[PDB]
Amino acid sequence: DAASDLKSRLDKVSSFHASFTQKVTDGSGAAVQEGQGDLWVKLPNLFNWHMTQPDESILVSDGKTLWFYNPFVEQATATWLKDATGNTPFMLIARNQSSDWQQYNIKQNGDDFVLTPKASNGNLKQFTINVGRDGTIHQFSAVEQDDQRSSYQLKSQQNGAVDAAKFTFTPPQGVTVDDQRKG
Ligand SMILES: CCCCCCCCCCCCCCCC(=O)N[C@H](CSC[C@H](COC(=O)CCCCCCCCCCCCCCC)OC(=O)CCCCCCCCCCCCCCC)C(N)=O
Incomplete structure (x- = not known):
């Protein structure tokens, strides 16, 4: 079915670098903001997301911690990845339990x-992904409770090995770190 097809496409993703563009649109379909940058990914749960436009920001998952670094206000926040991802289909990728997939209705064309x-x-009301049988991810989006859509268009998906140094984050010099990880 759609779920087993989706998972079979997601099984064919190992690791990649891609460029992304971002289009945020309100419920009425008008433009809210535009942005672009880089995404490094490595299954099951590692990523490095770098917005350059319009405002620079970095999300790094080392697989346990999600680091949010905003170099403009020279702040970095650390959260448990499981806390940060809990309202997303993250776990459909990060492990493969029947449980996780049963939490979603999936439609496919x-x-x-x-x-x-x-x-x-x-x-978060709804998620979309466009992904080929080869495991190339062309697009994904999230719809917020108020119908605001965030759409990511991916290109230049290079499926080489990516260095594991992409999924480490050390706060730079003079970056104040708000560590929100309760031990
Ligand atoms: C295999 C390795 C693991 C998976 C790979 C991950 C791919 C990229 C991950 C991060 C990209 C998204 C970050 C943008 C959000 C943002 O800049 N928020 C900034 C500041 S942060 C505030 C933000 C509040 O939340 C928001 O409003 C934004 C929406 C949250 C992102 C949802 C989009 C993904 C869902 C579409 C795909 C669904 C189908 C998957 C099929 C299984 O909450 C957060 O803190 C960020 C938490 C999200 C990080 C994890 C994303 C979960 C992705 C689930 C899997 C998607 C698969 C894509 C590639 C395989 C802001 N200004 O709001």
Whole structure:
């Protein structure tokens, strides 16, 4: 079915670097903001997301901690990855339990998938992904409770090995770190 097809496309992703553009649109479909940058990914749970435009910001998952670094205000926040990802389909990738997939209704037309949480919890109503049978991810989006859509268009997906140094984060010199990890 759509779920087993999606997982079989996601099984074919190992690690990549991609460039992304970002289009945020309100419920009425008007433009809220535009942005671009780089994404490094390595299954099951590692990523480095670098917005350059319009405002620079870095998200690094080392697989346990999610680091948010905003170099403009020279601040970095550390959170548990499981806390930070809990209102997303993260776990559909980060492990492969039947449990996780049963929390979503999935509709498919070719490379286009829509995932709707059964019980919607958090500000996130809906997710879309466009991913080929080869495992190239062309697009994903998240719809917030107020119908604001964040759309990511990916390109230049290079499926080489990516250095594991991409998924370490050391706060730079004179960056104040707000460590929100309760031990
Ligand atoms: C295999 C390795 C692991 C998976 C790879 C991950 C790929 C990139 C991960 C991070 C990219 C998104 C970061 C943008 C959000 C942002 O800049 N928020 C900034 C500041 S932070 C505030 C923000 C509040 O939340 C928001 O409003 C934004 C929406 C949250 C992002 C959802 C988009 C992804 C869902 C689409 C795909 C669904 C289908 C998957 C099929 C299984 O909350 C957070 O703190 C960020 C937490 C999100 C980080 C994890 C993303 C979960 C992705 C789930 C898997 C998607 C698969 C894509 C590639 C395989 C802001 N201004 O709001």
